[PDB]
Ligand binder design. Structure first.
Ligand SMILES: O=C(CO)N[C@H]1[C@H]([C@H](O)[C@H](O)CO)O[C@](O)(C(=O)O)C[C@@H]1O
Length: 482
């Protein structure tokens, strides 16, 4: 009766419905609970067949036929049917359903079932990464989702190698093995419990006491001490801290003001004291180790005087605003340093307010009831291609229109044209993406302050084949006990 126990670092901030499950711990749970037709490996990010019975057969440039894995089953016993696959795509694509993820499949024109086994995928244009993106659209049980979406959001039913048992905020997420799963990554333990330990001291203690076998997001100050008994490995990651403005609210609609507040921040002090060197001031949308990294034409290295000159040019004589920030432990350590830099400026006064992530977005950001936010973000949980990473924040309406309120600008429209150019025209995508990034880096509606490295601690003697993620989350796919 072997079990796994893990210490997770992000509180539950969304439900588990893949239509909208953007919170880290939710996404990390759904890698185990759901399957795309093809999935990405949480460590290697390589694609593998999941619900797809074999490699998608491409009839022509716009048309793909995909077949279902014989005997596929949802956790409630029903079979995975081709109607479920179609419902899964149509509901993400349906604007009335309010998904957070349709801007990850803009190339998809139709998803039609041809019979009990086969689904035709019709594309609006040739798109090379069609297999790669299927991991974003998890296949969901229509007949359960239609009896009540919010009940499914709280008790997710999937076809993955683990079934959901229960989830209790501040406590734990619980899974059990799915014994009819017939994919590539069957569950190697019976019971899996994820303790929700967002407090750094508590997370460390759990691991250092031996009460859990691995923990996410090792606190930087505790990293070396924990190597005494445990493997600790720090991975370079797209994971970042962004600065987000409400671009409908004066004076933050003036890019001139948004730039000054980046210049005012002393990133080096931040990297030394909070991250003990394990992060890097942003020099572009990507981190400098990302394969498509191309240095941006705007850089924002600590320059107070430029920040002053820019505010004077904007006509800011006495700005007061509240900074909203999430509750994560390392975001709490960054907030004073940030505020100290802004409050150093002659014309700016800044107060601070922390909120749980879930409440920050649903009660403040989603409603425009803010001015300035810092929060962590890691869209590479969805994959690593540049268009994916840009699209998260800059395609469509999910962030630019519903959240940072910049879709009204000409720069926004020009970023749309550039993003669409680059996925239609692979030959010219590099050039198009550099123009889009330079526009983003000059306008800074939402833009990274730093990218950081992720430490994961685990016990090599107790687990088998565990590897740390280059993103948020833990993965126990193919991971055994001992
Ligand atoms: O970047 C992504 C991609 O799903 N999601 C981020 C997620 C996302 O920004 C929120 O759910 C709002 O969409 O926020 C957090 O869960 C958090 O602030 O606690 C971090 C998480 O990485």
């Amino acid at each position: 009766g072997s079990t796994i126990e893990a210490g997770i670092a992000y509180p539950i901030s969304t439900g588990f419905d893949p239509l909208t499950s953007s919170g880290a711990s939710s996404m990390a749970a759904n890698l185990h609970i759901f399957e795309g037709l093809v999935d990405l490996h949480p460590v290697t990010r390589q694609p593998y067949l999941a619900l797809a019975a074999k490699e998608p057969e491409q009839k022509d440039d716009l048309t793909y036929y995909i077949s279902l894995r014989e005997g596929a089953m949802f956790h409630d016993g029903s079979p995975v049917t081709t109607e479920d696959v179609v419902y899964s795509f149509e509901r993400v694509l349906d604007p009335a359903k309010a998904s957070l993820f349709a801007q990850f499949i803009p190339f998809i024109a139709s998803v039609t079932a041809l019979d009990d086994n086969v689904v035709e995928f019709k594309l609006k244009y040739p798109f090379a990464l069609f297999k790669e993106r299927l991991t974003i659209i998890k296949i969901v049980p229509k007949h359960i989702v239609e009896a009540g979406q919010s009940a499914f959001d709280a008790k997710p039913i999937g076809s993955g190698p683990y079934k959901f048992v229960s989830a209790t905020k501040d406590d734990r997420i619980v899974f059990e093995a799915n014994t009819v799963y017939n994919g590539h990554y069957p569950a190697k333990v019976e019971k899996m419990t994820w303790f929700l330990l967002s407090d750094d001291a508590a997370r460390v203690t759990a691991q250092e006491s031996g009460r859990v076998q691995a923990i996410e997001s090792v606190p930087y100050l505790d990293a070396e001490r924990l190597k005494r008994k445990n493997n600790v490995e720090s991975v370079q990651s797209f994971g970042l801290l962004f600065l987000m403005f409400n671009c409908e609210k004066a004076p933050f609609d003036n890019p001139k003001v948004r730039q000054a507040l980046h210049y005012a921040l002393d990133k080096q002090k931040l990297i030394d004291i909070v991250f003990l060197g394990n992060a890097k001031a942003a020099t572009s949308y990507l981190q400098d180790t990302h394969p498509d990294y191309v240095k941006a034409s705007s850089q924002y290295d600590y320059d107070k005087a430029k920040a002053e000159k820019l505010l004077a040019e904007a006509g800011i004589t006495n700005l007061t605003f509240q900074l909203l920030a999430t509750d994560h432990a390392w975001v709490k350590e960054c907030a004073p340093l940030i505020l100290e830099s802004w409050n150093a400026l002659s014309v700016v006064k800044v107060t601070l307010q922390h909120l749980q992530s879930g409440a920050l977005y649903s009660a403040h950001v989603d409603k425009g009831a803010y001015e300035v936010v810092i929060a962590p973000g890691d869209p590479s949980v969805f994959g690593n291609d540049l268009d994916l990473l840009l699209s998260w924040w800059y395609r469509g309406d999910v962030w630019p229109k519903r959240r940072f309120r910049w879709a009204n600008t000409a720069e926004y429209h020009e970023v749309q044209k550039l993003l669409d150019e680059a996925i239609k025209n692979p030959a010219g995508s590099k050039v198009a993406w550099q123009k889009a990034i330079n526009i983003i880096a000059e306008q800074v509606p939402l833009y990274p302050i730093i990218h950081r490295k992720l430490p994961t601690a685990w016990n090599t003697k107790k687990l088998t084949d565990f590897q740390p993620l280059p993103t948020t989350g833990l993965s126990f796919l193919g991971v055994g006990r001992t």
